[PDB]
Design a protein around this motif. Structure first.
Motif, short mmCIF file in Angstrom:
data_model
loop_
_atom_site.label_atom_id
_atom_site.label_comp_id
_atom_site.label_asym_id
_atom_site.label_seq_id
_atom_site.Cartn_x
_atom_site.Cartn_y
_atom_site.Cartn_z
N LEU A 1 -23.81 16.84 10.54
CA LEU A 1 -24.86 15.84 10.62
C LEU A 1 -26.19 16.41 11.10
CD1 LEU A 1 -24.35 12.33 10.71
CD2 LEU A 1 -22.87 14.03 9.63
N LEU B 1 -29.35 8.53 8.79
CA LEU B 1 -28.33 9.55 8.62
C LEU B 1 -27.94 9.64 7.14
CD1 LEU B 1 -26.16 8.24 11.57
CD2 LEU B 1 -27.76 10.15 11.67
N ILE C 1 -25.76 10.39 3.65
CA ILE C 1 -24.42 10.07 3.19
C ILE C 1 -23.59 11.34 2.98
CG2 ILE C 1 -23.11 8.66 1.59
CD1 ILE C 1 -25.55 7.25 2.86
N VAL D 1 -21.68 12.88 5.90
CA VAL D 1 -20.60 11.98 6.29
C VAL D 1 -19.42 12.10 5.35
CG1 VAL D 1 -19.91 9.58 6.56
CG2 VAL D 1 -22.15 10.34 7.37
N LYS E 1 -21.05 5.92 2.45
CA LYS E 1 -22.25 5.19 2.84
C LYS E 1 -21.99 4.24 4.01
CE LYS E 1 -25.73 1.88 0.96
NZ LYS E 1 -26.02 0.92 -0.17
N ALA F 1 -21.52 5.95 7.21
CA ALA F 1 -22.81 6.48 7.66
C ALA F 1 -23.63 5.38 8.34
CB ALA F 1 -23.58 7.08 6.48
N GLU G 1 -24.71 4.99 12.23
CA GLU G 1 -26.12 4.76 12.52
C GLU G 1 -26.25 3.64 13.55
OE1 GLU G 1 -30.28 3.92 10.00
OE2 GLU G 1 -28.38 3.02 9.36
#
Lengths: 66, 66
Positions: A3, B3, B5, B8, B26, B29, B33
């Motif tokens: 990340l 952040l 995708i 992740v 998604k 993520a 977030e």
């Protein structure tokens, strides 16, 4: 790691921080990474038990809500 | 949101996922977030009461274990 650091740093600034130390953003990002891994593991379990190789939105939701 | 995708999605795979639906990655993520912000808001509080405008590592560490 995985990340990016910049987005997390910005998230702290959005939470109200005027300034964020480089290491603070890195640490949070690192923690989010292991948390993501933790949740992901349960997600993969839900897929395997469904006879699935692909992890879907349903697997993730259940994983987050554990 | 903030952040990405892709990172992740990759974490889900490193957790054992052979395949991951774009949506699955998604949603995880977005949750990460939402979670980071919650943690961050707590981090800004410790910082503020410490009289600091810069969020440090000590603040993030405490916000994480809340």
């Amino acid at each position: 790691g995985e990340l990016p650091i910049a987005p997390v740093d910005r998230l702290i600034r959005k939470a109200g921080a005027e300034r964020v130390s480089e290491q603070a953003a890195k640490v949070l990002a690192e923690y989010l990474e292991e948390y993501a891994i933790e949740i992901a593991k349960k997600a993969v379990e839900f897929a395997r038990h469904a006879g699935r190789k692909t992890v879907k939105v349903e697997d993730i939701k259940l994983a987050i809500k554990s």
